[PDB]
Amino acid sequence: NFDYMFKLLIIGNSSVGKTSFLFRYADDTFTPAFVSTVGIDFKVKTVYRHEKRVKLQIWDTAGQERYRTITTAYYRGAMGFILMYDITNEESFNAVQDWATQIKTYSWDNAQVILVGNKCDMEEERVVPTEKGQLLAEQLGFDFFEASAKENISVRQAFERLVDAICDKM
Amino acid sequence: PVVCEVVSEAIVHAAQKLKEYLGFEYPPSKLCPAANTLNEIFLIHFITFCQEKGVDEWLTTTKMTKHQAFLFGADWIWTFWGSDKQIKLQLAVQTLQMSSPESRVESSWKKSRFDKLEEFCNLIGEDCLGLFIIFGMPGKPKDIRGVVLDSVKSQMVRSHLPGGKAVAQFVLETEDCVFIKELLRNCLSKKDGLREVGKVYISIL
Numbered sequence A: 001n002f003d004y005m006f007k008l009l010i011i012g013n014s015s016v017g018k019t020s021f022l023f024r025y026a027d028d029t030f031t032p033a034f035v036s037t038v039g040i041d042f043k044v045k046t047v048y049r050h051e052k053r054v055k056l057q058i059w060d061t062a063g064q065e066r067y068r069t070i071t072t073a074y075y076r077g078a079m080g081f082i083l084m085y086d087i088t089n090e091e092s093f094n095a096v097q098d099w100a101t102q103i104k105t106y107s108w109d110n111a112q113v114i115l116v117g118n119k120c121d122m123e124e125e126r127v128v129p130t131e132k133g134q135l136l137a138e139q140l141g142f143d144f145f146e147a148s149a150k151e152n153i154s155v156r157q158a159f160e161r162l163v164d165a166i167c168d169k170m
Numbered sequence B: 001p002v003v004c005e006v007v008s009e010a011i012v013h014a015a016q017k018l019k020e021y022l023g024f025e026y027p028p029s030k031l032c033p034a035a036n037t038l039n040e041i042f043l044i045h046f047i048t049f050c051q052e053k054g055v056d057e058w059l060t061t062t063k064m065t066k067h068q069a070f071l072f073g074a075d076w077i078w079t080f081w082g083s084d085k086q087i088k089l090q091l092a093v094q095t096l097q098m099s100s101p102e103s104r105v106e107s108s109w110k111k112s113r114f115d116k117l118e119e120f121c122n123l124i125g126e127d128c129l130g131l132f133i134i135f136g137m138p139g140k141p142k143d144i145r146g147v148v149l150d151s152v153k154s155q156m157v158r159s160h161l162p163g164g165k166a167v168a169q170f171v172l173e174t175e176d177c178v179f180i181k182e183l184l185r186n187c188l189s190k191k192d193g194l195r196e197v198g199k200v201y202i203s204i205l
């Protein structure tokens, strides 16, 4: 059907949970088996937003540096970005300003960006307070969520907020 | 220990195991088996051989998904890791049958598998090589042989063919060959010695 077809990219460092995030949103499941994405992949999900069907093609990128070129070759045509870090990994959070610069350099399209701190179920191993993440989100102009691909917390809410921002820019 | 000799052994063993299924045709039904079936048989035998020799720590086989095989023009990736746990080589392998599908994207992907493989290897970097593996030829349908992408490109600067026809042209005219052990002998120390292989094909048997 699809009057609307939106291109979304999930980007961020390796091991923050990007593939797990996409699989939880698309198939409602989680496996602990870490396999690192080689290059880029995508999935298509259709949603009933406020009135009518919207088809999202969501591109999971690879976080490793050697694929940084090829993933940036797929930033064109993007209307939305999930910039994702890990709340148990400070190196992932220190990189998000570089990732936001990468979005502004290689993509812009005036595309909406949302900042997600994944693995919020791992509170015993938390290293980044939520206040730091929401302060940097206020600074960069992005919406902020703390999510868990493992426990399905704030996962579909983040995609819904990104799609709502994309629709509100029309 | 030695990664290169085991990967060449595994390629030879997988080709010998795949030889049984090449050239099968049943005229009262579907003639040919699917390309994905031959790819999966080759990969299963290769991966089991590599697991038996304990080389999984320095060798990673990634079978591309249907989307990834469409986008990259490659059927699988072989990643060669070093002692320092960094990636030293990546072979992007596309398979062809010479005896004789986007499905989700919204087209701009009009390119052939050759051009997509070349663009993939350009984007990854200089340590990512492209490799065509041919299962069967016109005449002798059970022959398996490899061709490096750069040798094809060196022939396209002369012949002016599109790369898909240029590979098929290269395979049926080249008499000179290099064994897979000799090709993979370098494999870690120098990168360009893989791509300066020249006007030869790769012999697997």
Ligand SMILES: Nc1nc2c(ncn2[C@@H]2O[C@H](COP(=O)(O)OP(=O)(O)NP(=O)(O)O)[C@@H](O)[C@H]2O)c(=O)[nH]1
Pocket: A012, A013, A014, A015, A016, A017, A018, A019, A020, A021, A031, A032, A033, A034, A035, A036, A037, A038, A061, A062, A063, A064, A118, A119, A120, A121, A122, A147, A148, A149, A150, A151
């Ligand atoms: N506890 C917990 N673990 C998670 C969560 N999301 C992912 N993980 C774990 O973190 C690891 C990495 O997940 P993965 O999705 O592969 O991350 P990635 O960003 O796709 N890695 P890459 O960019 O290299 O492809 C896996 O072991 C996975 O089980 C989460 O919400 N909670």
Ligand SMILES: [Mg+2]
Pocket: A018, A019, A020, A035, A036, A037, A060, A061, A062
């Ligand atoms: Mg991944």
